[PDB]
Amino acid sequence: ATFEIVNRCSYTVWAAASKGDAALDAGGRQLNSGESWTINVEPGTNGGKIWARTDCYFDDSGSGICKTGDCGGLLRCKRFGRPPTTLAEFSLNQYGKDYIDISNIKGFNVPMDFSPTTRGCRGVRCAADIVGQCPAKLKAPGGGCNDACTVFQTSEYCCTTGKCGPTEYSRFFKRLCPDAFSYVLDKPTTVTCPGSSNYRVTFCPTA
């Protein structure tokens, strides 16, 4: 499937795409304001994520570090990144359908729109100024707004053991972006699309 990744932000971002134990396509790439990157994602991919990384630097070797979403110091991501990271999540060709969603379960760093470029389903977007309204305890020193589990690391926040409900910190994300998961047990905000759809992930959407 084709995923078009577009950086409409005023700042540069380093896009990343991985399935957890491998890169998707080249796995990562710098994206100056205005640039786009078209990747190919194998059908059948389950558990894929796309995210943006901010404030990175790398050497000629592709080794370095990012302030948000670092994936083990690499430019070309093989694994998932460190929070806070707004996430575009997808599982494709699962019994004939594609399932997509945006999650704030690992915090938020950059606003995002995740929409199909094919017919048959709606997109999801989280573009409120979450960073700007982020509760004091959640603010990431490197920028971004952490989720509460990352910060507090307690069952109440992590759902370490099934039982968990919303908290004031989850509700904060939820209020600002109702279409994105705000906690593990949040009521699903996943969109079902026809199998083999194509998508566009835009950072800092304007519409």
Coordinates of N, CA and C in Angstrom, one line a residue:
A1 N 0.9 -1.2 0.0 CA 0.0 0.0 0.0 C 0.9 1.2 0.0
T2 N 0.4 2.3 -0.5 CA 1.2 3.5 -0.5 C 0.8 4.4 0.6
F3 N 1.7 5.0 1.3 CA 1.5 6.0 2.3 C 2.4 7.2 1.9
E4 N 1.7 8.3 1.8 CA 2.3 9.5 1.5 C 2.5 10.3 2.8
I5 N 3.7 10.6 3.2 CA 3.9 11.3 4.5 C 4.3 12.8 4.2
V6 N 3.6 13.7 4.6 CA 3.7 15.1 4.3 C 4.0 16.0 5.6
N7 N 5.1 16.8 5.5 CA 5.4 17.6 6.6 C 4.9 19.0 6.2
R8 N 3.8 19.4 6.8 CA 3.3 20.8 6.6 C 3.8 21.7 7.8
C9 N 4.5 21.2 8.7 CA 5.0 22.0 9.8 C 6.0 23.0 9.3
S10 N 6.2 24.1 10.1 CA 7.1 25.1 9.8 C 8.5 24.6 10.1
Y11 N 8.6 23.7 11.0 CA 9.9 23.1 11.4 C 10.2 21.8 10.7
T12 N 11.4 21.4 10.6 CA 11.7 20.1 10.0 C 11.4 19.0 11.0
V13 N 11.0 17.9 10.5 CA 10.8 16.7 11.2 C 11.5 15.5 10.6
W14 N 11.8 14.5 11.3 CA 12.4 13.3 10.9 C 11.3 12.2 11.0
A15 N 10.7 11.9 9.9 CA 9.6 10.9 9.9 C 10.2 9.5 10.1
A16 N 9.4 8.7 10.7 CA 9.8 7.3 11.0 C 8.6 6.4 10.7
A17 N 9.0 5.2 10.3 CA 7.9 4.1 10.0 C 8.5 2.8 10.3
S18 N 7.8 2.0 11.2 CA 8.3 0.7 11.6 C 7.2 -0.1 12.0
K19 N 7.4 -1.4 12.1 CA 6.5 -2.3 12.6 C 7.0 -2.9 13.9
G20 N 7.9 -2.3 14.5 CA 8.2 -2.8 15.8 C 9.5 -3.6 15.8
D21 N 9.6 -4.5 14.9 CA 10.9 -5.2 14.8 C 11.5 -5.1 13.5
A22 N 11.1 -4.1 12.7 CA 11.7 -3.8 11.4 C 11.2 -2.5 10.9
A23 N 12.0 -1.9 10.0 CA 11.6 -0.7 9.4 C 10.6 -0.9 8.4
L24 N 9.8 0.0 8.1 CA 8.9 -0.1 7.0 C 9.6 0.8 5.9
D25 N 9.8 0.3 4.7 CA 10.4 1.1 3.7 C 11.8 1.5 4.2
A26 N 12.4 2.7 4.0 CA 13.7 3.1 4.5 C 13.7 3.3 6.0
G27 N 12.5 3.3 6.7 CA 12.4 3.4 8.1 C 12.5 4.8 8.7
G28 N 13.1 5.8 8.0 CA 13.1 7.1 8.4 C 13.7 8.1 7.4
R29 N 13.4 9.3 7.6 CA 13.9 10.3 6.6 C 13.6 11.7 7.1
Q30 N 14.6 12.6 6.8 CA 14.4 14.0 7.1 C 13.4 14.6 6.2
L31 N 12.5 15.4 6.8 CA 11.5 16.1 6.0 C 11.4 17.6 6.4
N32 N 12.0 18.4 5.5 CA 11.9 19.9 5.7 C 10.5 20.3 5.5
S33 N 10.3 21.5 6.0 CA 9.0 22.0 5.9 C 8.5 22.0 4.4
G34 N 7.3 21.4 4.3 CA 6.9 21.3 2.9 C 7.2 20.0 2.1
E35 N 8.2 19.2 2.5 CA 8.5 18.0 1.8 C 7.6 16.8 2.2
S36 N 7.6 15.9 1.2 CA 6.8 14.7 1.4 C 7.6 13.5 1.0
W37 N 7.2 12.3 1.5 CA 7.9 11.1 1.4 C 6.8 10.0 1.1
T38 N 7.0 9.3 0.0 CA 6.1 8.3 -0.3 C 6.6 6.9 0.0
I39 N 6.0 6.2 0.8 CA 6.5 4.9 1.1 C 5.6 3.8 0.7
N40 N 6.2 2.6 0.5 CA 5.5 1.4 0.2 C 5.4 0.5 1.4
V41 N 4.2 0.1 1.8 CA 4.0 -0.7 3.0 C 3.4 -2.0 2.5
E42 N 4.0 -3.1 2.8 CA 3.6 -4.4 2.4 C 2.2 -4.7 2.9
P43 N 1.4 -5.3 2.0 CA 0.1 -5.7 2.4 C 0.2 -6.7 3.6
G44 N -0.8 -6.7 4.4 CA -0.7 -7.7 5.4 C 0.1 -7.1 6.6
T45 N 0.7 -6.0 6.5 CA 1.4 -5.4 7.7 C 0.5 -5.2 8.9
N46 N 0.9 -5.8 10.0 CA 0.1 -5.7 11.2 C 0.8 -4.9 12.2
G47 N 0.2 -3.9 12.8 CA 1.0 -3.3 13.9 C 2.0 -2.2 13.5
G48 N 1.8 -1.6 12.3 CA 2.7 -0.6 11.8 C 2.3 0.8 12.5
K49 N 3.4 1.6 12.6 CA 3.2 3.0 13.1 C 4.1 3.9 12.3
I50 N 3.6 5.1 12.2 CA 4.3 6.2 11.6 C 4.4 7.4 12.7
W51 N 5.5 8.0 12.8 CA 5.5 9.1 13.8 C 6.5 10.1 13.3
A52 N 6.4 11.3 13.9 CA 7.5 12.3 13.6 C 8.5 12.4 14.8
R53 N 9.6 12.8 14.5 CA 10.6 13.0 15.5 C 11.1 14.5 15.4
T54 N 11.4 15.1 16.5 CA 11.8 16.5 16.4 C 13.2 16.7 16.9
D55 N 13.8 17.8 16.5 CA 15.1 18.2 17.0 C 16.1 17.1 17.0
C56 N 16.4 16.5 15.8 CA 17.4 15.5 15.7 C 18.7 16.0 15.1
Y57 N 19.7 15.2 15.3 CA 20.9 15.3 14.6 C 21.6 14.0 14.5
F58 N 22.1 13.8 13.3 CA 22.8 12.6 12.9 C 24.1 12.8 12.2
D59 N 24.9 11.8 12.3 CA 26.2 11.9 11.5 C 26.1 11.4 10.2
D60 N 27.2 11.2 9.5 CA 27.2 10.8 8.1 C 26.8 9.4 8.1
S61 N 27.0 8.7 9.2 CA 26.7 7.3 9.4 C 25.2 7.0 9.6
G62 N 24.4 8.0 10.0 CA 22.9 7.8 10.3 C 22.7 7.5 11.8
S63 N 23.7 7.9 12.5 CA 23.7 7.8 13.9 C 23.6 9.1 14.6
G64 N 22.8 9.1 15.7 CA 22.6 10.4 16.3 C 21.5 10.4 17.4
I65 N 20.7 11.4 17.5 CA 19.7 11.5 18.5 C 18.6 12.6 18.2
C66 N 17.4 12.3 18.7 CA 16.2 13.2 18.5 C 15.7 13.5 19.9
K67 N 15.1 14.6 20.0 CA 14.5 15.1 21.3 C 13.1 14.5 21.6
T68 N 12.4 14.2 20.5 CA 11.2 13.4 20.7 C 11.2 12.3 19.7
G69 N 10.7 11.2 20.1 CA 10.5 10.0 19.3 C 11.8 9.3 18.9
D70 N 12.9 9.4 19.6 CA 14.1 8.7 19.2 C 13.9 7.2 19.1
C71 N 14.4 6.6 18.0 CA 14.3 5.1 17.9 C 15.7 4.5 18.0
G72 N 16.2 4.4 19.2 CA 17.6 3.9 19.4 C 18.7 4.6 18.7
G73 N 18.6 5.9 18.5 CA 19.7 6.6 17.9 C 19.9 6.5 16.4
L74 N 18.9 5.9 15.7 CA 19.1 5.8 14.3 C 18.3 6.7 13.5
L75 N 18.8 7.0 12.4 CA 18.0 7.8 11.4 C 17.0 6.9 10.8
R76 N 17.4 5.7 10.4 CA 16.5 4.8 9.8 C 15.9 3.9 10.8
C77 N 14.7 4.2 11.3 CA 14.1 3.4 12.4 C 13.8 2.0 12.2
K78 N 14.2 1.1 13.1 CA 13.9 -0.3 13.0 C 12.8 -0.7 14.0
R79 N 12.9 0.0 15.1 CA 12.1 -0.1 16.3 C 11.3 1.1 16.6
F80 N 10.4 1.1 17.6 CA 9.5 2.2 17.9 C 10.2 3.3 18.7
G81 N 9.7 4.5 18.7 CA 10.5 5.6 19.3 C 10.1 5.9 20.7
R82 N 10.9 6.7 21.4 CA 10.7 7.1 22.8 C 9.6 8.2 22.8
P83 N 8.7 8.1 23.8 CA 7.7 9.2 24.0 C 8.3 10.5 24.3
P84 N 7.6 11.6 24.0 CA 6.2 11.6 23.6 C 6.1 11.6 22.1
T85 N 5.2 10.8 21.6 CA 5.0 10.8 20.1 C 3.6 10.5 19.8
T86 N 3.1 11.4 19.0 CA 1.7 11.3 18.4 C 1.9 10.1 17.5
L87 N 1.0 9.1 17.5 CA 1.1 8.0 16.6 C 0.0 7.7 15.6
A88 N 0.5 7.4 14.3 CA -0.5 7.0 13.3 C -0.3 5.5 13.4
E89 N -1.3 4.7 13.6 CA -1.2 3.3 13.7 C -2.1 2.6 12.7
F90 N -1.5 1.4 12.2 CA -2.4 0.7 11.2 C -2.1 -0.8 11.1
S91 N -3.1 -1.5 10.8 CA -3.0 -2.9 10.6 C -3.7 -3.2 9.2
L92 N -3.0 -3.7 8.2 CA -3.6 -3.8 6.9 C -4.0 -5.1 6.4
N93 N -5.1 -5.2 5.6 CA -5.4 -6.5 5.1 C -5.7 -7.6 6.1
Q94 N -6.5 -7.2 7.1 CA -6.8 -8.1 8.2 C -8.2 -8.7 7.9
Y95 N -8.2 -9.8 7.4 CA -9.6 -10.3 7.1 C -10.4 -9.4 6.1
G96 N -9.7 -8.7 5.2 CA -10.3 -7.9 4.2 C -10.4 -6.5 4.5
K97 N -10.0 -6.1 5.7 CA -10.1 -4.7 6.0 C -8.8 -4.1 6.6
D98 N -8.7 -2.8 6.5 CA -7.6 -2.1 7.0 C -8.2 -1.3 8.3
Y99 N -7.4 -1.3 9.4 CA -7.8 -0.6 10.6 C -6.8 0.5 11.0
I100 N -7.2 1.7 11.1 CA -6.3 2.8 11.3 C -6.8 3.6 12.5
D101 N -5.8 4.3 13.1 CA -6.2 5.1 14.3 C -5.0 6.0 14.5
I102 N -5.3 7.1 15.4 CA -4.3 7.9 15.9 C -4.3 7.7 17.4
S103 N -3.2 7.6 18.1 CA -3.1 7.3 19.5 C -2.3 8.4 20.2
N104 N -2.7 8.8 21.4 CA -2.0 9.7 22.3 C -1.6 8.9 23.5
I105 N -1.6 7.6 23.4 CA -1.2 6.7 24.5 C 0.2 6.9 24.9
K106 N 1.1 7.2 23.9 CA 2.5 7.5 24.2 C 2.8 9.0 24.1
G107 N 1.8 9.8 24.4 CA 2.0 11.2 24.5 C 1.8 11.9 23.1
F108 N 2.1 13.1 23.0 CA 1.9 13.8 21.8 C 3.1 14.7 21.5
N109 N 3.5 14.8 20.3 CA 4.6 15.8 20.0 C 4.2 16.7 18.8
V110 N 3.6 16.1 17.8 CA 3.3 16.9 16.6 C 1.9 16.6 16.2
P111 N 1.2 17.6 15.7 CA -0.2 17.5 15.3 C -0.2 16.7 14.0
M112 N -1.3 15.9 13.8 CA -1.3 15.0 12.7 C -2.7 14.7 12.2
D113 N -2.7 14.5 10.9 CA -4.0 14.1 10.2 C -3.6 12.7 9.6
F114 N -4.5 11.7 9.7 CA -4.2 10.4 9.1 C -5.5 10.0 8.4
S115 N -5.4 10.2 7.0 CA -6.6 10.0 6.2 C -6.3 9.1 5.0
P116 N -7.4 8.4 4.6 CA -7.3 7.5 3.4 C -7.2 8.4 2.1
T117 N -6.5 7.9 1.1 CA -6.5 8.7 -0.2 C -7.3 8.0 -1.2
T118 N -7.9 6.9 -0.7 CA -8.8 6.0 -1.4 C -10.2 6.2 -0.9
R119 N -11.2 5.5 -1.5 CA -12.6 5.7 -1.0 C -13.0 4.8 0.1
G120 N -14.1 5.2 0.8 CA -14.7 4.3 1.7 C -14.6 4.4 3.2
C121 N -13.9 5.4 3.7 CA -13.8 5.5 5.1 C -13.3 6.9 5.4
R122 N -13.4 7.3 6.7 CA -13.1 8.7 7.1 C -11.6 8.7 7.6
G123 N -11.0 9.9 7.7 CA -9.7 10.0 8.3 C -9.9 10.4 9.8
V124 N -8.7 10.5 10.5 CA -8.8 10.9 11.9 C -7.7 11.9 12.1
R125 N -8.0 12.8 13.0 CA -7.0 13.9 13.1 C -6.9 14.3 14.6
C126 N -5.7 14.7 15.0 CA -5.4 15.2 16.3 C -4.6 16.5 16.1
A127 N -5.2 17.6 16.0 CA -4.4 18.8 15.7 C -4.6 19.9 16.7
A128 N -5.2 19.7 17.9 CA -5.3 20.7 18.9 C -3.9 21.1 19.4
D129 N -3.7 22.2 20.1 CA -2.4 22.6 20.7 C -2.2 21.9 21.9
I130 N -2.0 20.6 21.8 CA -1.8 19.9 23.1 C -0.5 20.3 23.9
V131 N 0.5 20.6 23.1 CA 1.8 20.9 23.7 C 1.6 22.2 24.5
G132 N 1.0 23.1 23.9 CA 0.6 24.4 24.5 C -0.3 24.3 25.7
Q133 N -1.1 23.3 25.9 CA -2.0 23.2 27.0 C -1.6 22.1 28.0
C134 N -0.5 21.4 27.7 CA -0.1 20.3 28.4 C 0.1 20.7 29.9
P135 N -0.5 19.8 30.8 CA -0.5 20.0 32.2 C 1.0 20.0 32.6
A136 N 1.2 20.8 33.7 CA 2.6 20.9 34.1 C 3.4 19.7 34.3
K137 N 2.9 18.7 35.0 CA 3.6 17.5 35.2 C 3.9 16.7 34.0
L138 N 3.1 17.0 32.9 CA 3.3 16.2 31.7 C 4.3 16.7 30.7
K139 N 4.6 18.0 30.8 CA 5.5 18.6 29.9 C 6.9 17.9 29.8
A140 N 7.3 17.5 28.6 CA 8.6 16.9 28.3 C 9.6 18.0 28.2
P141 N 10.7 17.8 29.0 CA 11.8 18.7 29.0 C 12.3 18.9 27.6
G142 N 12.3 17.8 26.7 CA 12.7 17.9 25.4 C 11.7 18.5 24.4
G143 N 10.5 18.8 24.9 CA 9.4 19.3 24.1 C 8.4 18.2 24.0
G144 N 7.1 18.6 23.6 CA 6.1 17.6 23.6 C 5.4 17.5 25.0
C145 N 4.4 16.6 25.1 CA 3.6 16.4 26.2 C 3.5 14.9 26.4
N146 N 4.1 14.4 27.5 CA 4.1 13.0 27.8 C 2.8 12.5 28.2
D147 N 2.6 11.2 28.0 CA 1.4 10.6 28.6 C 1.7 10.3 30.1
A148 N 0.6 10.1 30.9 CA 0.8 9.9 32.3 C 1.5 8.6 32.7
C149 N 1.4 7.5 31.9 CA 2.1 6.3 32.3 C 3.6 6.5 32.3
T150 N 4.0 7.1 31.2 CA 5.4 7.4 31.0 C 6.0 8.3 32.2
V151 N 5.2 9.2 32.6 CA 5.6 10.1 33.7 C 5.5 9.4 35.0
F152 N 4.4 8.8 35.4 CA 4.2 8.3 36.7 C 4.5 6.9 36.9
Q153 N 4.3 6.2 35.8 CA 4.5 4.7 35.8 C 3.9 4.0 37.0
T154 N 2.5 4.0 37.1 CA 1.7 3.3 38.1 C 0.6 2.6 37.3
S155 N 0.1 1.5 37.9 CA -0.9 0.7 37.3 C -2.1 1.6 36.9
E156 N -2.4 2.6 37.7 CA -3.5 3.5 37.5 C -3.3 4.2 36.2
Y157 N -2.1 4.6 36.0 CA -1.8 5.2 34.7 C -1.4 4.3 33.6
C158 N -0.8 3.2 33.9 CA -0.3 2.3 32.9 C -1.2 1.1 32.6
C159 N -2.3 0.9 33.4 CA -3.2 -0.2 33.3 C -2.4 -1.5 33.3
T160 N -1.3 -1.4 34.0 CA -0.4 -2.5 34.2 C -1.3 -3.8 34.5
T161 N -2.5 -3.7 35.1 CA -3.3 -4.9 35.3 C -4.7 -4.8 35.0
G162 N -5.0 -4.7 33.6 CA -6.4 -4.6 33.0 C -7.3 -3.5 33.6
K163 N -7.6 -3.5 34.8 CA -8.5 -2.5 35.5 C -7.9 -1.2 35.3
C164 N -8.6 -0.3 34.6 CA -8.0 1.0 34.6 C -9.1 1.9 34.0
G165 N -9.2 3.1 34.3 CA -10.2 3.9 33.7 C -9.5 5.1 33.4
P166 N -10.3 6.1 33.1 CA -9.7 7.3 32.7 C -9.2 8.0 33.9
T167 N -8.4 9.0 33.7 CA -7.8 9.8 34.7 C -7.9 11.3 34.3
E168 N -7.6 12.2 35.2 CA -7.7 13.5 34.7 C -6.7 13.7 33.6
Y169 N -5.6 13.0 33.6 CA -4.5 13.3 32.5 C -4.9 12.7 31.2
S170 N -5.6 11.5 31.2 CA -6.1 10.9 30.0 C -7.2 11.8 29.4
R171 N -8.1 12.3 30.3 CA -9.2 13.1 29.9 C -8.7 14.4 29.2
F172 N -7.6 14.8 29.6 CA -7.1 16.0 29.1 C -6.8 15.8 27.6
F173 N -6.2 14.7 27.2 CA -5.9 14.3 25.8 C -7.2 14.1 25.1
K174 N -8.1 13.4 25.8 CA -9.4 13.0 25.2 C -10.2 14.3 24.9
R175 N -10.2 15.3 25.7 CA -10.9 16.5 25.4 C -10.5 17.2 24.3
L176 N -9.1 17.2 24.2 CA -8.5 17.9 23.1 C -8.6 17.2 21.8
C177 N -8.5 15.9 21.8 CA -8.6 15.1 20.5 C -9.4 13.9 20.8
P178 N -10.7 14.0 20.7 CA -11.6 13.0 21.0 C -11.4 11.8 20.1
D179 N -10.9 12.0 18.9 CA -10.7 10.9 18.0 C -9.5 10.0 18.1
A180 N -8.7 10.3 19.1 CA -7.5 9.6 19.3 C -7.6 8.8 20.7
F181 N -6.9 7.6 20.7 CA -6.9 6.9 22.0 C -6.2 7.7 23.0
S182 N -6.8 7.8 24.3 CA -6.2 8.6 25.3 C -5.6 7.7 26.4
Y183 N -6.0 6.5 26.5 CA -5.5 5.5 27.4 C -5.8 4.1 26.8
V184 N -5.1 3.2 27.3 CA -5.2 1.8 26.8 C -6.5 1.3 26.7
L185 N -7.3 1.5 27.7 CA -8.7 1.0 27.7 C -9.7 1.9 27.1
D186 N -9.3 3.0 26.5 CA -10.1 4.0 26.0 C -11.1 3.3 25.0
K187 N -12.3 3.9 24.9 CA -13.2 3.3 23.9 C -12.6 3.5 22.5
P188 N -12.5 2.4 21.7 CA -11.9 2.5 20.4 C -12.3 3.6 19.5
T189 N -11.3 4.1 19.0 CA -11.5 5.2 18.1 C -11.0 4.8 16.7
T190 N -10.7 3.5 16.5 CA -10.2 2.9 15.3 C -11.2 3.1 14.1
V191 N -10.7 3.3 12.9 CA -11.6 3.4 11.7 C -11.3 2.2 10.9
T192 N -12.4 1.6 10.3 CA -12.3 0.5 9.5 C -12.3 1.0 8.1
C193 N -11.3 0.7 7.3 CA -11.2 1.0 5.9 C -11.2 -0.3 5.0
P194 N -11.5 -0.1 3.8 CA -11.5 -1.3 2.9 C -10.1 -1.8 2.8
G195 N -9.9 -3.1 2.7 CA -8.6 -3.6 2.6 C -7.8 -3.0 1.4
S196 N -6.5 -2.8 1.5 CA -5.7 -2.2 0.4 C -5.9 -0.8 0.1
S197 N -6.3 0.0 1.1 CA -6.5 1.4 0.9 C -5.1 2.0 0.8
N198 N -5.0 3.3 0.4 CA -3.8 4.1 0.4 C -4.0 5.2 1.4
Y199 N -3.0 5.8 2.0 CA -3.2 6.8 3.0 C -2.3 8.0 2.9
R200 N -2.6 9.0 3.6 CA -1.7 10.1 3.7 C -1.6 10.5 5.1
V201 N -0.4 10.7 5.6 CA -0.2 11.1 7.0 C 0.4 12.5 6.9
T202 N -0.3 13.5 7.5 CA 0.2 14.9 7.4 C 0.5 15.4 8.7
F203 N 1.8 16.0 8.9 CA 2.1 16.6 10.1 C 1.7 18.0 10.0
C204 N 1.1 18.5 11.1 CA 0.7 19.9 11.1 C -0.3 20.3 10.0
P205 N -1.4 19.5 10.0 CA -2.4 19.7 9.0 C -3.0 21.1 9.1
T206 N -3.5 21.7 8.0 CA -4.1 23.0 8.0 C -5.6 22.8 7.7
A207 N -5.9 21.7 7.1 CA -7.2 21.3 6.7 C -6.9 20.1 5.7

